[PDB]
């Protein structure tokens, strides 16, 4: 039948020499290793300019998957917006101005909300300072900030530094008041866990949740309970009279300064959807909100986009489609969006011939509680499909390393890696039996450093290079490649012509 070519992405699996806090190196990976010893391999740059990001910036699932599926260096939003601020164009943004014009003409309020850190994955605090300075320039009187605490793209208990810096800028620009503070767990969920979402929503609209006069005391009090940045309960900052600093009301304007869509869609829909059934918003639910998305989130969001998106044509998925091949995209909840939407270049609709399998991730708050996650069910489901001789190409993502690594815990991250390695063996073998080829790789680093030099949790990504194995004897892979070379390599294996849009180059010599 078919000799399937499979693209296998071991999420957050990177190569790093130091083995201290390196889950990847400490894990027993017989399968992975044997493939690395017995087949052609290399490494690829998945950070900075190589993937369309500023120099020094680390990579992540969105970037990685856009680039991997695009076959070219994809220009990222972070970079694009940093440049706008640099070139004096940010202040001339018609969407920002219209938002500020709105609150001024109708005398409502402007609210700014998003991740409060310099992680650069979902946002950057510097953009917020940019919106605050622009606001002061435009003469907006009432500006309120609703902060989503990080602890995931940055240190786990670094919120206080960001809060302190923000307070300095506030005083410097002369506008803005921190209204609420919520952990990204509740305000930026992407797993459709509406109870978490509702918590954040009700804090911002009804001033419901833990109340404090001082933002810093809110943080310190939560730490005392062992609850850090990422998981802090949506809290409300109150005034001297006990009233909330500010609640979101009819006709106010909202600028969500996040530039990555997966964790922004949910809370955005909660604010803009005329009909919302996931949960009851209650009778005061603010209506007529002038809503601004920093970048395109989804068509379901009844708002405006500051920076317009641009189609990426002829991504691996499209080429496969145009040539009549049947493709499958598969992963569990946590990375389902990446193997589908991002892999297809920011498109949600399946291509003709494209099949998708979604496997539910375990019902646990944090994955360090269940390292193997749902890796076995994914593998099972995939093996059946492989056995049926249905697909010409396959795109699989094992989310374990990144998900468990984000916990900053060494032992669980090792179990995760080993769980993935076991499954990987079963998958690559079955592929080989069908006479196909596999392309083992990753989208970015993480699991390779889940502890700081000092032995403390390291919850973020790394800048280390990712691995690449092509299960085909008799060939050689060139070095110095980048993720944008993977798509071309797959088309090479499939004997399909490479489109002009893909400015990348096959790794096969």
Phi, psi of 110 (to 5 degrees): -110, 125
Residues that bind Mn ion (CB under 5 A): 402
Pairing between strand 177-183 and 304-307? unpaired
Cα–Cα distance for residue pair 338/64, rounded to 1 Å: 9
Binding site partner of 122, from ligand 2PG, Mn ion, none, Cβ cut-off 5-8 A by kind: ligand 2PG
Query: Under a CB-based contact definition with an 8 Å cutoff, are residues 134 and 96 in contact?
Result: yes
Residue with Cβ nearer Mn ion (402 or 421): 402
Q: How many residues does the chain have?
A: 509
The site string for ligand 2PG over 473-492 (x = CB under 6 A, - otherwise) reads --------------------
Query: What whole-number distance in Å separates Cα of residue 438 and Cα of residue 386?
Result: 13
Task: Answer yes or no whether residue 152 interacts with ligand 2PG by CB under 6 A.
Answer: yes
Residue 118, number of CB atoms within 10 A of its CB? 17
Q: Report what 153 binds from Mn ion, ligand 2PG, none; CB cut-off 5-8 Å by kind.
A: ligand 2PG
Instruction: Measure the CA–CA gap between 504 and 509, rounded to whole angstroms.
Output: 14
Cβ 60 to Mn ion shortest distance, Å: 6
Nearer to Mn ion, 346 or 445 (CB): 445
Q: Are 421 and 27 in contact (CB under 8 A)?
A: yes
Contacts to ligand 2PG from residues 273-332, by CB under 6 A: none
Distance CA 186, CA 182 (A): 7
Site map 377..406 versus ligand 2PG, x via CB under 6 A: -------------------------x----
Contact of 356 with 329, CB cutoff 8 Å: yes
From ligand 2PG, Mn ion, none, interface partner of 506 (C-beta below 5 to 8 A by class) = none
Tokens 């930026």 — which residue? 188
User: In the range 232-271, which residues lie near ligand 2PG by CB under 6 A?
Assistant: 263
Binding marks (x or -) toward ligand 2PG, 65..104, rule CB under 6 A? ----------------------------------------
Nearest-approach distance from CB 391 to ligand 2PG, in angstroms? 25
DSSP letters for 227-251: --GGG---EEEB-TTS-BS----TT
Please identify, using beta-carbon distances, which residue of 102 and 152 lies nearer to ligand 2PG.
152
Is 199 an interacting residue with respect to ligand 2PG (CB under 6 A)? no
Q: Which is nearer to ligand 2PG, 127 or 152 (CB)?
A: 152
Q: Which two tokens stand for residue 144?
A: 């309120």
Residue number, 10 or 205, with CB nearest to ligand 2PG = 10
CA dihedral 189, 191, 192, 193 (to 10 degrees): -70
Between 121 and 491, whose beta carbon lies closer to Mn ion?
121
Phi, psi of 289 (to 5 degrees): -85, 130
Closest separation between CB of residue 11 and ligand 2PG, Å?
6
106-125 footprint of ligand 2PG as x/- string (CB under 6 A)? ---------------xx---
Answer left, alpha or beta for residue 442, where phi above 0 means left and psi between -120 and 50 means alpha: beta
Number of residues located near ligand 2PG, criterion CB under 6 A: 8
Q: Which residues bind ligand 2PG (CB under 6 A)?
A: 60-61, 121-122, 152-153, 263, 402
């Amino acid at each position: 039948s078919k000799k399937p070519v499979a693209l296998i992405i071991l999420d957050g699996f990177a190569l790093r020499d130091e083995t201290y806090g390196n889950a990847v190196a400490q894990a027993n990976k017989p399968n992975f290793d044997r493939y690395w010893n017995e087949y052609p391999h290399t490494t690829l740059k998945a950070c900075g300019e190589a993937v369309g990001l500023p120099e020094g910036q680390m990579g992540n699932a969105e970037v990685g998957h856009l680039n991997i599926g695009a076959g070219r260096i994809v220009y990222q939003s972070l970079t694009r917006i940093n440049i706008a601020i640099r070139e004096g164009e940010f202040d001339r943004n018609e969407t920002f101005l219209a938002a500020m014009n709105h609150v001024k003409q109708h005398g409502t309020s402007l609210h700014l909300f998003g991740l409060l850190s310099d992680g650069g994955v979902h946002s950057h605090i510097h953009h917020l300072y940019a919106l605050l300075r622009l606001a002061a320039k435009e003469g907006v009187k009432r500006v309120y900030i609703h902060g989503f605490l990080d602890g995931r793209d940055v240190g786990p208990q670094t919120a206080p530094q960001y809060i302190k810096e923000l307070q300095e800028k506030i005083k410097e620009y002369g506008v803005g008041e921190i209204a609420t503070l919520s952990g990204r767990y509740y305000s930026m969920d992407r797993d459709k866990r509406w109870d978490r979402v509702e918590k954040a929503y009700r804090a911002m609209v009804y001033g419901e949740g833990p109340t404090y006069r001082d933002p810093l005391e809110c943080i310190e009090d939560s730490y005392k309970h062992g609850i850090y940045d990422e998981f802090v309960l949506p809290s409300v900052i109150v005034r001297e009279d006990g009233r909330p600093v500010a609640t979101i009301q009819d006709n106010d304007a909202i600028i969500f300064y996040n530039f990555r869509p997966d964790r922004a869609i949910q809370i955005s829909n909660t604010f803009t959807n005329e009909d919302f059934r996931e949960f009851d918003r209650g009778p005061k639910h603010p209506k007529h909100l002038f809503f601004v998305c920093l970048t395109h989130f989804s068509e379901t969001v009844a708002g405006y986009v500051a920076f317009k998106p641009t189609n990426l044509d002829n991504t691996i998925g499209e080429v496969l489609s145009q040539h009549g091949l049947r493709q499958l995209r598969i992963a569990e909840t946590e990375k389902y969006p990446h193997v589908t939407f991002f892999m297809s270049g920011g498109r949600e609709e399946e291509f003709p011939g494209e099949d998708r399998i979604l496997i539910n991730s375990p019902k646990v708050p944090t994955y360090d509680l269940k390292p193997e996650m749902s890796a076995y069910e994914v593998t099972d489901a995939l093996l059946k499909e492989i056995e049926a001789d249905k697909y010409d190409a396959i795109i699989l993502n094992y989310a374990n390393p990144d998900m468990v690594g984000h916990s900053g815990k060494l032992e669980p991250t090792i179990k995760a890696v080993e769980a993935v390695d076991e499954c990987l063996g079963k998958v690559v073998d079955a592929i080989l039996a069908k006479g196909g080829i596999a392309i083992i790789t990753a989208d970015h680093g993480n699991a390779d450093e889940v502890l700081t030099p000092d032995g403390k949790p390291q919850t973020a990504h790394t800048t280390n290079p990712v691995p690449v194995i092509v299960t085909k004897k008799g060939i050689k892979l060139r070095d110095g490649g980048i993720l944008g070379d993977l798509a071309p390599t797959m088309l090479d294996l499939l004997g399909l012509p490479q489109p002009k849009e893909m400015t990348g180059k096959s790794l096969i010599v």
